[PDB]
Scaffold this motif. Structure first.
Motif, PDB file in Angstrom:
ATOM      1  N   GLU B 176      11.166  89.166 -27.907  1.00 25.78           N
ATOM      2  CA  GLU B 176      12.460  89.610 -28.414  1.00 25.78           C
ATOM      3  C   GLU B 176      13.404  88.415 -28.445  1.00 25.78           C
ATOM      4  O   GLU B 176      13.967  88.033 -27.420  1.00 25.78           O
ATOM      5  N   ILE B 177      13.500  87.782 -29.620  1.00 26.93           N
ATOM      6  CA  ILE B 177      14.288  86.569 -29.846  1.00 26.93           C
ATOM      7  C   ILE B 177      15.572  86.816 -30.630  1.00 26.93           C
ATOM      8  O   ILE B 177      16.294  85.867 -30.941  1.00 26.93           O
ATOM      9  N   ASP B 178      15.863  88.085 -30.939  1.00 29.10           N
ATOM     10  CA  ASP B 178      17.063  88.447 -31.697  1.00 29.10           C
ATOM     11  C   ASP B 178      18.052  89.199 -30.829  1.00 29.10           C
ATOM     12  O   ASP B 178      17.708  89.632 -29.723  1.00 29.10           O
ATOM     13  N   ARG B 179      19.291  89.346 -31.328  1.00 28.10           N
ATOM     14  CA  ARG B 179      20.309  90.164 -30.681  1.00 28.10           C
ATOM     15  C   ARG B 179      20.185  91.540 -31.345  1.00 28.10           C
ATOM     16  O   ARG B 179      20.507  91.674 -32.531  1.00 28.10           O
ATOM     17  N   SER B 278      29.154  92.435 -24.548  1.00 31.96           N
ATOM     18  CA  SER B 278      29.631  91.058 -24.773  1.00 31.96           C
ATOM     19  C   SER B 278      28.841  90.008 -23.983  1.00 31.96           C
ATOM     20  O   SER B 278      28.678  88.883 -24.451  1.00 31.96           O
ATOM     21  N   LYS B 279      28.327  90.400 -22.807  1.00 32.06           N
ATOM     22  CA  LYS B 279      27.532  89.569 -21.893  1.00 32.06           C
ATOM     23  C   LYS B 279      26.026  89.688 -22.163  1.00 32.06           C
ATOM     24  O   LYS B 279      25.251  89.054 -21.465  1.00 32.06           O
ATOM     25  N   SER B 280      25.604  90.534 -23.105  1.00 29.49           N
ATOM     26  CA  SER B 280      24.179  90.758 -23.338  1.00 29.49           C
ATOM     27  C   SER B 280      23.605  90.089 -24.575  1.00 29.49           C
ATOM     28  O   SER B 280      24.332  89.531 -25.398  1.00 29.49           O
ATOM     29  N   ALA B 281      22.269  90.142 -24.678  1.00 31.64           N
ATOM     30  CA  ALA B 281      21.488  89.678 -25.816  1.00 31.64           C
ATOM     31  C   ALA B 281      20.413  90.758 -25.984  1.00 31.64           C
ATOM     32  O   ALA B 281      20.780  91.875 -26.343  1.00 31.64           O
ATOM     33  N   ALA B 282      19.139  90.491 -25.623  1.00 34.81           N
ATOM     34  CA  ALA B 282      18.060  91.480 -25.729  1.00 34.81           C
ATOM     35  C   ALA B 282      18.277  92.684 -24.799  1.00 34.81           C
ATOM     36  O   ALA B 282      18.088  93.824 -25.225  1.00 34.81           O
ATOM     37  N   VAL B 283      18.678  92.428 -23.535  1.00 29.52           N
ATOM     38  CA  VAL B 283      18.955  93.480 -22.540  1.00 29.52           C
ATOM     39  C   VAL B 283      20.305  93.222 -21.870  1.00 29.52           C
ATOM     40  O   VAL B 283      20.898  92.151 -22.043  1.00 29.52           O
ATOM     41  N   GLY B 284      20.750  94.185 -21.075  1.00 29.99           N
ATOM     42  CA  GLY B 284      21.958  94.037 -20.281  1.00 29.99           C
ATOM     43  C   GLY B 284      21.588  93.433 -18.944  1.00 29.99           C
ATOM     44  O   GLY B 284      20.395  93.310 -18.629  1.00 29.99           O
ATOM     45  N   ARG B 285      22.601  93.051 -18.143  1.00 28.23           N
ATOM     46  CA  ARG B 285      22.383  92.434 -16.826  1.00 28.23           C
ATOM     47  C   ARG B 285      21.649  93.377 -15.872  1.00 28.23           C
ATOM     48  O   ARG B 285      20.875  92.912 -15.044  1.00 28.23           O
ATOM     49  N   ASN B 286      21.902  94.691 -15.979  1.00 25.16           N
ATOM     50  CA  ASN B 286      21.256  95.678 -15.109  1.00 25.16           C
ATOM     51  C   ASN B 286      19.770  95.957 -15.435  1.00 25.16           C
ATOM     52  O   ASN B 286      19.077  96.529 -14.600  1.00 25.16           O
ATOM     53  N   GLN B 287      19.274  95.518 -16.620  1.00 23.76           N
ATOM     54  CA  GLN B 287      17.872  95.689 -17.030  1.00 23.76           C
ATOM     55  C   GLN B 287      17.096  94.363 -16.951  1.00 23.76           C
ATOM     56  O   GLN B 287      15.864  94.364 -16.972  1.00 23.76           O
ATOM     57  N   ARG B 304       8.641  85.856 -24.725  1.00 22.56           N
ATOM     58  CA  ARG B 304       9.949  85.302 -25.066  1.00 22.56           C
ATOM     59  C   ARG B 304      11.009  86.378 -24.986  1.00 22.56           C
ATOM     60  O   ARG B 304      10.832  87.467 -25.537  1.00 22.56           O
ATOM     61  N   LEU B 305      12.116  86.077 -24.300  1.00 21.19           N
ATOM     62  CA  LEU B 305      13.224  87.020 -24.173  1.00 21.19           C
ATOM     63  C   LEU B 305      14.559  86.327 -24.370  1.00 21.19           C
ATOM     64  O   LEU B 305      14.895  85.420 -23.609  1.00 21.19           O
ATOM     65  N   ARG B 306      15.346  86.793 -25.348  1.00 19.38           N
ATOM     66  CA  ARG B 306      16.657  86.228 -25.624  1.00 19.38           C
ATOM     67  C   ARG B 306      17.646  86.641 -24.530  1.00 19.38           C
ATOM     68  O   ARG B 306      17.768  87.826 -24.212  1.00 19.38           O
ATOM     69  N   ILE B 307      18.320  85.664 -23.929  1.00 20.96           N
ATOM     70  CA  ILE B 307      19.309  85.958 -22.901  1.00 20.96           C
ATOM     71  C   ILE B 307      20.649  85.314 -23.253  1.00 20.96           C
ATOM     72  O   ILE B 307      20.686  84.254 -23.883  1.00 20.96           O
ATOM     73  N   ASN B 308      21.737  85.961 -22.853  1.00 26.15           N
ATOM     74  CA  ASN B 308      23.090  85.459 -23.082  1.00 26.15           C
ATOM     75  C   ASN B 308      23.451  84.509 -21.922  1.00 26.15           C
ATOM     76  O   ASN B 308      22.973  84.708 -20.802  1.00 26.15           O
ATOM     77  N   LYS B 309      24.306  83.501 -22.175  1.00 25.60           N
ATOM     78  CA  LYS B 309      24.772  82.531 -21.154  1.00 25.60           C
ATOM     79  C   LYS B 309      25.444  83.232 -19.961  1.00 25.60           C
ATOM     80  O   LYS B 309      25.303  82.789 -18.817  1.00 25.60           O
ATOM     81  N   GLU B 310      26.172  84.329 -20.247  1.00 26.72           N
ATOM     82  CA  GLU B 310      26.866  85.169 -19.265  1.00 26.72           C
ATOM     83  C   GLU B 310      25.882  85.832 -18.289  1.00 26.72           C
ATOM     84  O   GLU B 310      26.270  86.192 -17.181  1.00 26.72           O
TER      85      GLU B 310
END
Lengths: 54, 355
Positions: B176-179, B278-287, B304-310
């Motif tokens: 998962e490389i997309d938002r 706003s802090k997520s990409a592929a998943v949220g922080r809780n997942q 591959r997993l897309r992650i946000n800098k946050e």
């Protein structure tokens, strides 16, 4: 200042990794959030996330 | 007994990682300086739960509870009942079972009894709509959390049935490389032992914050009364941003305390959901911890997993350090080729048969 490398340097604390990179327990499932007051003010406009929607 | 950890930090994760790897661990200096040292009743209860779902484990706890030696047994599962002490809701105990259940010899069919919600732990809806869709994306076709009774704090009296029919060799390899695009906002606003007006007021609060968005907002009103509603008045709300294309989700949750305003809770959770998006990409922080572990335990292939800098926070850092101590696996992070965002790709070689 490479985050991937900083994470695996045990001589550096997690909080120090974040500071060097830019600018705390999984026993608590719910992630950290800024105060409701700060969030309500920031989220009066939904523009910063309009691209995430169809 | 030899891979050694310090304190109560990530207690469930460390025991879960030892269980999945088959590697013995030692957890020492647990609340050493404290007036009340060592393991809390809920951590001891979690260890009893680990013993009930595995076979051949050795668990040794020092006299004052400051040291735990864990030599893991094989994941066996089966049908059981777990009584959750008041100190933690059912979700505290269900959450680590999610990391083990699909990799069991026999299906997990566990009845959890006690309080069903807190301010700090995974709620019923967080599990059903947040964590379970992530495990489904990883190949856990059949997983369910049946809500028989709700049990709001302080008295509880709740009952949930965890059933994971899907037994798999390992999670599928993550790509998962997309938002993911959010197609709608759903959720569950619930209450126990109170008038239906409280749920309607939380929905009013959430809708006030969410009406500005360009998508459909449909929040379920789930009013519980009588015997199945448990022993205490209570109310809570989980809001879920849905992505229909692949089945990804983002969520925020919280419960209200006695004397609090339901509209305010609705507003807060809606603000928290937008912040989580706003802090997520592929998943949220809780997942993210669950997704991370599921890739570590995949077959010998690169996920591959897309992650946000946050999402690269102190919690993410400690998670990665714990994984490496157990599995020797490092997560590689490369920036995305885009200029629109500062996201990165987490690449992980699954453990496969590697020792």
């Amino acid at each position: 200042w490479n985050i991937g490398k900083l994470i695996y340097m045990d001589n550096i604390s997690p909080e120090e990794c974040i500071r060097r990179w830019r600018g705390v327990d999984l026993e608590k499932f719910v992630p950290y959030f800024d105060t409701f007051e700060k969030l309500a003010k920031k989220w009066k406009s939904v523009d910063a996330i309009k691209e995430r929607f169809l | 007994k030899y891979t050694t950890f310090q304190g109560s930090q990530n207690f469930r994760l460390r025991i879960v990682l030892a269980t999945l790897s088959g590697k013995p661990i030692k957890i020492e200096k647990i609340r050493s300086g404290d007036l009340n040292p060592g393991l809390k009743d809920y951590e001891v209860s979690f260890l009893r739960l680990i013993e009930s779902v595995t076979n051949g484990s050795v668990i040794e706890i020092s006299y004052t509870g400051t040291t735990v030696i864990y030599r893991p047994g094989i994941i066996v599962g089966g049908a059981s009942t777990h009584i959750c002490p008041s100190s933690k809701p059912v979700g505290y105990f269900v959450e680590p079972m999610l990391y083990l259940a699909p990799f069991s010899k026999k299906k997990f069919s566990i009845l959890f009894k006690g309080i069903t919600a807190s301010h700090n732990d995974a709620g019923i809806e967080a599990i059903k709509w947040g964590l379970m869709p992530v495990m489904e994306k990883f190949g856990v076709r059949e997983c369910a959390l049946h809500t028989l009774k709700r049990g709001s704090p302080p008295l509880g009296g709740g009952e949930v049935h965890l059933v994971v029919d899907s037994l798999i060799a390992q999670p599928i390899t993550m790509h998962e490389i997309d938002r993911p695009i959010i197609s709608s906002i759903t959720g569950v606003a619930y209450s126990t032992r109170v008038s239906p007006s409280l749920v309607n007021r939380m929905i009013d609060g959430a809708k006030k914050v969410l009406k500005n968005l360009q998508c459909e907002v449909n929040i379920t009103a789930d009013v519980w009364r009588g015997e199945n509603s448990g022993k205490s008045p209570g109310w809570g709300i989980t809001l879920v941003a849905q992505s229909k294309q692949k089945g990804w989700s983002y969520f925020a949750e919280d419960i209200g305390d006695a004397g609090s305003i339901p509209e305010e809770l609705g507003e807060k959770v809606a603000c928290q959901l937008l912040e989580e998006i706003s802090k997520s990409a592929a998943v949220g922080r809780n997942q993210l911890p669950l997704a991370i572990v599921y890739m570590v335990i995949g077959k010998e292939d690169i996920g591959r997993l897309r992650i946000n800098k946050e999402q690269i926070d102190e919690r993410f850092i400690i998670l990665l350090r714990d994984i490496k101590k157990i599995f020797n696996t490092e997560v590689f992070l490369k920036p995305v080729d885009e200029a629109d965002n500062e996201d990165m790709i987490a690449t992980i070689k699954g453990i496969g048969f590697t020792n």
